[PDB]
Protein backbone atom coordinates (compact mmCIF):
# COMPACT_ATOMS: atom_id res chain seq x y z
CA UNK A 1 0.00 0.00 0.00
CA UNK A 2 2.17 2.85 -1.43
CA UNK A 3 0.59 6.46 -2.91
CA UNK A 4 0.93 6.60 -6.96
CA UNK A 5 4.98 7.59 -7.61
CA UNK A 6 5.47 6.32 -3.80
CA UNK A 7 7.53 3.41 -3.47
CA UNK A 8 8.04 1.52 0.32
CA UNK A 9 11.18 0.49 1.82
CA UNK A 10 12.49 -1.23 4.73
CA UNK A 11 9.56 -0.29 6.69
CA UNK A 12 8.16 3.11 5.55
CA UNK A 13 6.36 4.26 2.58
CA UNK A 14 8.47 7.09 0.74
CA UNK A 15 7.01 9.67 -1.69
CA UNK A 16 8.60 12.60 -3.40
CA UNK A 17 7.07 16.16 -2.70
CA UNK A 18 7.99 18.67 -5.71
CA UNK A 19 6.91 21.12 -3.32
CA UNK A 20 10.23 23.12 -1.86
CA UNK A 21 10.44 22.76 2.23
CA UNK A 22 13.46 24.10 4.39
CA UNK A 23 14.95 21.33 5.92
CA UNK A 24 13.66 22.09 8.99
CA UNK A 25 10.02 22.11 7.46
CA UNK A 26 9.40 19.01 5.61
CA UNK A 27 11.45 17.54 9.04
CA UNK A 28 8.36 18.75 10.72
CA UNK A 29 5.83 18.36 8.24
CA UNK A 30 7.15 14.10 6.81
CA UNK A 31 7.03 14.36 10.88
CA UNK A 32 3.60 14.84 10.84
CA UNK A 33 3.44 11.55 9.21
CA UNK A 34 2.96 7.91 11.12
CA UNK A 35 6.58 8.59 12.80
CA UNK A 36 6.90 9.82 9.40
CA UNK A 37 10.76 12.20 8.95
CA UNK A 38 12.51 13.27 5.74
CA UNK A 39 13.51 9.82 4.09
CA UNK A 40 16.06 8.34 5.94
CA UNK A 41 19.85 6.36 4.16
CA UNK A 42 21.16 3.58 6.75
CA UNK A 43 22.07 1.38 3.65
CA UNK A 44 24.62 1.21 0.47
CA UNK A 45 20.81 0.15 -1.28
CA UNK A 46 18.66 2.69 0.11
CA UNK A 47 21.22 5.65 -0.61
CA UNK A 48 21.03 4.18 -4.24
CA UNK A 49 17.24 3.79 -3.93
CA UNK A 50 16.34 7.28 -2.66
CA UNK A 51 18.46 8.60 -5.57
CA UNK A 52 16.72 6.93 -8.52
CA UNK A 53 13.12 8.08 -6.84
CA UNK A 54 14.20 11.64 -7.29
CA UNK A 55 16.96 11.38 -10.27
CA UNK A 56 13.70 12.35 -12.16
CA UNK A 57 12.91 15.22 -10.37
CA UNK A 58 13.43 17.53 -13.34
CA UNK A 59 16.50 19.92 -14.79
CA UNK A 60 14.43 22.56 -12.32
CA UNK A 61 16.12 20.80 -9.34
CA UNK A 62 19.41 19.38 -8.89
CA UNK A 63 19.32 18.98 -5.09
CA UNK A 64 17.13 17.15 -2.47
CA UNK A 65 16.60 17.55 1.15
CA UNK A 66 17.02 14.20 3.39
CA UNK A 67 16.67 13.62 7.06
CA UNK A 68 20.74 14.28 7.82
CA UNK A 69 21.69 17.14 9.85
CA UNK A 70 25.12 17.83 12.38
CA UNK A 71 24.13 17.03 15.67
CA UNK A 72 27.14 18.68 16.51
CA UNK A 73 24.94 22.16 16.49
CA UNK A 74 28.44 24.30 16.27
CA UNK A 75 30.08 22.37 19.13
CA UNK A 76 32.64 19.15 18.42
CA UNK A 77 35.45 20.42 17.68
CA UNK A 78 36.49 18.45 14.94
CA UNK A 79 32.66 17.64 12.68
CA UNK A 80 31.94 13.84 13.19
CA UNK A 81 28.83 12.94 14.28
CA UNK A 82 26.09 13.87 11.19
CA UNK A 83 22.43 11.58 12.70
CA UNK A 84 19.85 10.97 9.96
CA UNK A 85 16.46 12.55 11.93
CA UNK A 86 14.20 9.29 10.39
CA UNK A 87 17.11 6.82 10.85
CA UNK A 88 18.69 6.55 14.00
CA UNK A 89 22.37 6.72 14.02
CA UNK A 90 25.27 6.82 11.61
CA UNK A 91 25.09 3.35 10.96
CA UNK A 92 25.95 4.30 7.06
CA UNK A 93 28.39 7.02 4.71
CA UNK A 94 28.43 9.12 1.97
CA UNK A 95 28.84 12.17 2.37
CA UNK A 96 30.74 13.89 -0.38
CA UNK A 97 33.76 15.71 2.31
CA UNK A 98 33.57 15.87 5.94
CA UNK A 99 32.08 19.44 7.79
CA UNK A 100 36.08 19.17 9.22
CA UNK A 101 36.81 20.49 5.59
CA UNK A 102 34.90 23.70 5.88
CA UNK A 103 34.28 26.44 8.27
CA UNK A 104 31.71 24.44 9.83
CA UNK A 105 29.66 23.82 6.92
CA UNK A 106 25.35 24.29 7.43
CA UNK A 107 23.49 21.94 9.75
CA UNK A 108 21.71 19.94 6.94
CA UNK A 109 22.78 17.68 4.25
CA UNK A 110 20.77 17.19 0.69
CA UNK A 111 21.37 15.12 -2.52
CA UNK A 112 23.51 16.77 -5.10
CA UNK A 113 22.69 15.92 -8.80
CA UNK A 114 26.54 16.10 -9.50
CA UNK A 115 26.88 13.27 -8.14
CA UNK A 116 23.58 11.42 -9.75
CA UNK A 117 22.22 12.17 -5.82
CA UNK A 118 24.84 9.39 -4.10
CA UNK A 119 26.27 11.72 -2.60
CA UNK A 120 25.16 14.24 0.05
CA UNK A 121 26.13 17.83 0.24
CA UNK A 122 25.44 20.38 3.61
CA UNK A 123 23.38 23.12 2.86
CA UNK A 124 21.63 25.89 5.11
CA UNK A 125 18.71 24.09 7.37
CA UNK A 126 17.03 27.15 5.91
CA UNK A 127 17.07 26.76 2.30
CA UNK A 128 14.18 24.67 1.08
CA UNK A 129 14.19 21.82 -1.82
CA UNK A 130 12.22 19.55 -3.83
CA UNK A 131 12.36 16.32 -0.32
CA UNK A 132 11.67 12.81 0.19
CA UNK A 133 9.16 11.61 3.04
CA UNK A 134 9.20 8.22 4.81
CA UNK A 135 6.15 7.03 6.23
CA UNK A 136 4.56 3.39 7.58
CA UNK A 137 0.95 2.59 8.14
C-alpha cells in the first residue's frame, strides 16, 4: 500500500514532494506523518534507492533535502557525528567531504545531482528543496 509515484522500503512508505520545504520544514511536516521524517539512508541500497526516486525530479532541481543534519549544532570540535532525523544513528556514509573540511559547513545535508544524488552535500537548514518523506501505516 504505497501512494501513486510512492515506493516503500524497509519499513516506511516514501514519496517525493515537488513542493520546496526548508529542511527544517518538511522535518516537521514528513514528521507529521505515522513517525513519518525526511527519508532516511542507513544502507549502500537505500542511498542508491532514494536517488533513482528523485533522479527524475526535473532539470528545475538538482538537489534534495534528506533527514541528515550535524548534531554537533556548532560544538565538536572536529565535525563527526552527522544523525539521519528518520534513521537513527550513523550506521551508514556518503557524504561527499567531511564538515572538518569547511568552516563548519550548514546543519543539513541534501542530494547533489553532480553526483547522480549518491552523494550528500550540507546546505543551510534554511534553504528549502524539492524532499523525500518516509512514512509506515
Amino acid at each position: 500500500r504505497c501512494p501513486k509515484g510512492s515506493k516503500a522500503y524497509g519499513s516506511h512508505c516514501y514519496a517525493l514532494f515537488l513542493s520546496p520545504k526548508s529542511w527544517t520544514d518538511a522535518d516537521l511536516a514528513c514528521q507529521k506523518r505515522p513517525s513519518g521524517n525526511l527519508v532516511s539512508v542507513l544502507s549502500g541500497a537505500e542511498g542508491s534507492f532514494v536517488s533513482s526516486l528523485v533522479k527524475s525530479i526535473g532539470n528545475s532541481y538538482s538537489y534534495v533535502w534528506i533527514g541528515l543534519h550535524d548534531p554537533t549544532q556548532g560544538t565538536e570540535p572536529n565535525g563527526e557525528g552527522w544523525e539521519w532525523s528518520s534513521s537513527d544513528v550513523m550506521n551508514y556514509f556518503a557524504w561527499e567531504r567531511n564538515p572538518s573540511t569547511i568552516s563548519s559547513p550548514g546543519h543539513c545535508a541534501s542530494l547533489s545531482r553532480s553526483t547522480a544524488f549518491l552523494r550528500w552535500k550540507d546546505y543551510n537548514c534554511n534553504v528549502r528543496l524539492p524532499y523525500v518523506c518516509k512514512f509506515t501505516d
